[PDB]
């Protein structure tokens, strides 16, 4: 790792500076270096890791979608080659994240909160791989995302209240998986609705701060349901 010579605390600090500078590729590299120090991550550190790579892969996905649409309208080799270039870099980022989860974030995560967070991430990055996959690896990728998401759901329902923001975001993303990847829009709609209603009924238990956290994600569930019905 090019970050192996930097102190863990300095890597975290620089990840926070990169975030403020909207330098998400740097941020992700700093957080990768932090993970590779081998210690567990705190909640804030998990959020830093997730924000960094979500932004990196998000830009790659947006670019891939633009190029894929151009490629589709066109059907020279240039559009395909350049789509393939972006696709390969995107898969590389996903493989990097999944590698971090497998070596060794998931196995070392004892607390429910951390294990759910990382299994959700594993579902997310297999989902991003599935978006660009074509073939027999596609089915295996899709089922792998589902298994990670469902294991995270089972833990979150045992160990977290229905308003917990990681539980809510897991459900939000798994719902999107059902709708856009698994061709299961009724499953997606049922999951977002049940998640929303269960959280609504639990809001009475929350402080003002927790209420803010939970209703932010509940709004995204409602935003998707409005789009889907």
């Amino acid at each position: 790792g090019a970050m192996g010579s930097m102190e863990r605390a300095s890597l975290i600090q620089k990840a926070k500076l990169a975030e403020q500078a909207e330098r998400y590729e740097d941020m992700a590299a700093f957080m990768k270096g932090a993970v590779e120090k081998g210690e567990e991550l705190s909640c804030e550190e998990r959020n830093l890791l997730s924000v960094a790579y979500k932004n990196v892969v998000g830009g790659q996905r947006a670019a891939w979608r633009v190029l894929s649409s151009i490629e589709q309208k066109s059907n020279g080799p240039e559009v395909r080659e350049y789509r393939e270039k972006v696709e390969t870099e995107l898969q590389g980022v996903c493989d990097t994240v999944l590698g971090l989860l497998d070596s060794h974030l998931i196995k070392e995560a004892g607390d429910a909160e951390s294990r759910v967070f990382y299994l959700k991430m594993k579902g997310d990055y297999y989902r991003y791989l599935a978006e660009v996959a074509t073939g027999d690896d596609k089915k295996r990728i899709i089922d792998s995302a589902r298994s990670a998401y469902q294991e995270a759901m089972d833990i979150s329902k045992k160990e977290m209240p229905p308003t917990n923001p990681i539980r809510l975001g897991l459900a939000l993303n798994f719902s999107v998986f059902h709708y856009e990847i698994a061709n299961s829009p009724e499953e997606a709609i049922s999951l977002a609705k049940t998640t929303f209603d269960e959280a609504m009924a639990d809001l009475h238990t929350l402080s003002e701060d927790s209420y803010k956290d939970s209703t932010l994600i509940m709004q995204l569930l409602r935003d998707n349901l409005t789009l889907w019905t």
Binding site: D124, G169, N173, V176, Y179, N224, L227, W228
Partner: peptide
């Protein structure tokens, strides 16, 4: 395109 977090 739908929201994810």
């Amino acid at each position: 395109f739908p929201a994810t977090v």
